[PDB]
Amino acid sequence: TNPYARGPNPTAASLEASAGPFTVRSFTVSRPSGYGAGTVYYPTNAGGTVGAIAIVPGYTARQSSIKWWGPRLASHGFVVITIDTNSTLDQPSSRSSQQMAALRQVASLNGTSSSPIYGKVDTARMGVMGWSMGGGGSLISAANNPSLKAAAPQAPWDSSTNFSSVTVPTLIFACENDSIAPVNSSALPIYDSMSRNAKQFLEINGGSHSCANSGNSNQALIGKKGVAWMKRFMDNDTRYSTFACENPNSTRVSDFRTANCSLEH
Ligand SMILES: [Cl-]
Ligand SMILES: [Cl-]
Ligand code: NA
Ligand code: NA
């Protein structure tokens, strides 16, 4: 059997729900190591060690913009750290360094007997997410650390759109009407540059640049897809292959693309 499989068999309803099967607690990081601030969300009853995901905001933004992912993912069996950057005005490369520093510190806390996450993390299984420049930073993290198991940035931007070196399974959430990082000049060229990975592009119909942030009105679909992608690729959990790889065939999705996701016999 798959040693990383956690939780009950998924359904559309169970993945669209506000909360997954596991009870979630959280704590503030006392002394951030290489980033500004962090909140760690974790399941108290996942029944085995789980992977870790680090999530970074966009320019000027704070944990609030990305917070909803913490409980949503942790409740399905992940340790999730949402960060504030050293400065709200840090650029993508710095955001990537800080994201990886947050993953490092989650690994440290996994080995710290006083930590609520002591022994809860499989430090070999990690993922990266983030908004806008924090999404660009997630793609930089993946490019520089190919042992990461999944990436799922939202409304990404970087000074370069060429992420051809990314071999990590990558889901790009995009926002159709984004006027900050227009899809046609940012998210879509980024998607098209990646040639060696499992990848997906999911654009929310009518979405502004904040369409995947806390308080969005598509938490059922966006949360289903983010959880399914992380389950499929961080846990190798093929119970999630359809949810991860499918076109939702949704009137809420103005553009859907995927490649190298479904397995061919
Ligand atoms: Cl930004
Ligand atoms: Cl916008
Ligand atoms: Na690259
Ligand atoms: Na539209």
Side-chain angles (χ1 to χ4, degrees):
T1 67
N2 178 356
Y4 309 139
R6 307 281 174 268
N9 295 346
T11 65
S14 80
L15 299 186
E16 289 164 12
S18 294
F22 302 132
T23 299
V24 175
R25 292 189 69 188
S26 63
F27 62 90
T28 299
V29 177
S30 174
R31 186 186 189 288
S33 169
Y35 59 98
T39 306
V40 174
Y41 299 85
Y42 62 99
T44 64
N45 62 334
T49 56
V50 297
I53 301 169
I55 316 189
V56 185
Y59 198 74
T60 82
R62 292 185 168 82
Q63 290 179 63
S64 179
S65 64
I66 53 168
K67 169 169 174 175
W68 77 286
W69 282 120
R72 181 52 165 278
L73 283 155
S75 71
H76 287 274
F78 296 99
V79 170
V80 184
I81 184 165
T82 58
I83 71 166
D84 294 307
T85 50
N86 288 326
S87 167
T88 68
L89 309 181
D90 290 333
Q91 298 290 320
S93 289
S94 172
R95 292 177 188 277
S96 175
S97 299
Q98 293 181 64
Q99 180 172 52
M100 298 310 299
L103 287 173
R104 183 190 162 281
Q105 186 160 31
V106 167
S108 169
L109 294 174
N110 182 63
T112 300
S113 66
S114 59
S115 178
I117 59 166
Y118 186 54
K120 288 200 168 62
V121 184
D122 184 340
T123 63
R125 304 187 296 111
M126 290 176 164
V128 288
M129 298 176 65
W131 178 38
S132 202
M133 282 180 187
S138 296
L139 293 154
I140 295 169
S141 288
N144 288 331
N145 304 95
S147 74
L148 286 168
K149 285 185 64 50
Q154 65 199 53
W157 181 88
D158 187 56
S159 53
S160 183
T161 59
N162 184 0
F163 284 95
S164 72
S165 69
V166 174
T167 57
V168 175
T170 297
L171 165 59
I172 292 166
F173 294 109
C175 301
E176 183 179 28
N177 292 342
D178 198 323
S179 201
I180 303 305
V183 174
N184 286 346
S185 56
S186 199
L188 183 59
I190 289 169
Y191 177 81
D192 279 340
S193 75
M194 294 184 288
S195 62
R196 290 195 310 304
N197 59 345
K199 63 174 186 176
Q200 189 161 114
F201 184 79
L202 191 162
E203 182 186 81
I204 299 295
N205 185 43
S208 76
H209 184 57
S210 58
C211 82
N213 291 10
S214 303
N216 78 75
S217 286
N218 282 293
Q219 293 176 46
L221 171 60
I222 294 173
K224 167 168 65 178
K225 274 284 183 182
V227 169
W229 195 262
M230 295 285 150
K231 282 278 197 184
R232 173 59 182 84
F233 294 112
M234 294 181 57
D235 298 359
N236 309 325
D237 190 344
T238 63
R239 297 180 293 171
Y240 290 81
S241 294
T242 302
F243 296 118
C245 297
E246 69 186 347
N247 184 341
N249 295 329
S250 172
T251 65
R252 295 167 174 263
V253 173
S254 44
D255 195 331
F256 177 82
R257 312 175 191 217
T258 201
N260 303 325
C261 193
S262 302
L263 302 178
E264 296 179 1
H265 207 273

